[PDB]
């Protein structure tokens, strides 16, 4: 529950704010919990351990195709039932991918990473970078490279560097996202 897999002490040690009384525990908790789902929704990976799923299925294409929604597991049969089946049928997925082949057609399986020793460092580094940006960079002034404040005489360049994911946070998490094809 985010207390065991991201100790506030590690955050306070990363962003070097362990002596700031202007970042209370409740505020850091709000940051840590708004950034464990603003960059989990973005990657579509639950963080709890192996977590069973059940969902409907709609075949696509004349040669049959079953697009799932979890990238289920490595080596455990996903089973199909209902929908004109006379007996639950078991398919084996191929690692990483979430496509299969052969009164609504249902499917069940188990997604997630085996152990409780949860999300790898890649995910955590992104959060640490996102939190740090959030605590010492509120959205009040447009910035520029380094952190200078320019003029431009014309429109500022600050399309994003106001408060967006400029830190290598958002892109670190992406290393884990999956370009379709």
């Amino acid at each position: 529950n985010l207390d065991t897999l991201l100790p506030l002490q590690t955050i306070r040690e990363h962003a070097k704010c362990d002596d700031n009384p202007r970042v209370t525990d409740d505020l850091l908790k709000l940051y840590r919990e708004a950034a464990f789902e603003a960059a989990e929704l973005y990657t579509g990976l639950s963080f709890t351990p192996e977590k069973t799923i059940v969902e409907p299925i709609r075949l696509k294409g004349r040669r049959g195709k079953i697009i799932l929604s979890a990238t289920p597991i490595a080596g455990r049969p996903v089973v199909f039932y209902g929908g004109g089946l006379g007996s639950p049928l078991e398919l084996i997925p191929r690692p990483g991918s979430n496509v299969l082949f052969f009164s609504q057609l249902m499917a069940t399986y188990v997604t997630g990473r085996r152990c409780e020793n949860s999300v790898p460092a890649g995910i955590i580094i992104g959060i640490l970078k996102l939190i740090a940006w959030n605590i010492n960079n509120p959205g009040d002034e447009v910035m520029s490279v380094r952190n200078t404040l320019n003029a431009n005489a014309q429109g500022l360049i600050g399309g994003t560097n106001n408060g967006a994911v400029i830190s290598g946070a958002q892109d670190e998490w992406f290393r884990y996202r999956r370009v379709l094809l």
Binding site: T48, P49, E50, G82, E90
Partner: protein
Amino acid sequence: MYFFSVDPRNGASSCCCESISARPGEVNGVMVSYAAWSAPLRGHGLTNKTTFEIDGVSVTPPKVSNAFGRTKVGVVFEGTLSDLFPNPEGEQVEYEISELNGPSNGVVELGANGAFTYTPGALFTGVDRFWFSINGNIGEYVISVDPTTSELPQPPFTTPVYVPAARRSVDPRTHVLKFVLGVSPAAIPGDVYRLTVRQVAIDCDGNEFVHISCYDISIGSCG
């Protein structure tokens, strides 16, 4: 209608039992989806051999006791009530017969003082109940009307939380169990009961796969 999905027993995904809030007087419906546990076990799906059990984890024993009556067909029946509220302290006894939980095949006229007359409906023989309110405390009084010949037996004084005899069903084509969950008009707000459901599957040859789960029905007032 409540909906619970069972843990599928994979070694994978505050208290033990999931929680069910109830209100005194309702009769609700509960649904549980055993698909996560009964699908991989390729067999004949579910069978109708569920067994339930209620036991209390908090009771707050009742103040007013219940009682039993009898009469023949058509003959009007009289009775008292005060003899059902042994009070420890000294106060008045504001008898009330709620129109919501009145009788079903008769009519009861409460007197001013622990008195009531139960006129049975013409041409009717069975059981009839009604729930009185002795000074906030609720109990039931049960009347059985006889077909003028011999005598009727004595029914079991419905409990605070019960599961009706046979209104349960399981759809083996989609692995879903449906049962009904009723709360008496007498269940005291704040109490908590426990419902344990033992649902059994079956393999292609007819052996068994048993499954046990529990729920915490907490009798709450106002929803």
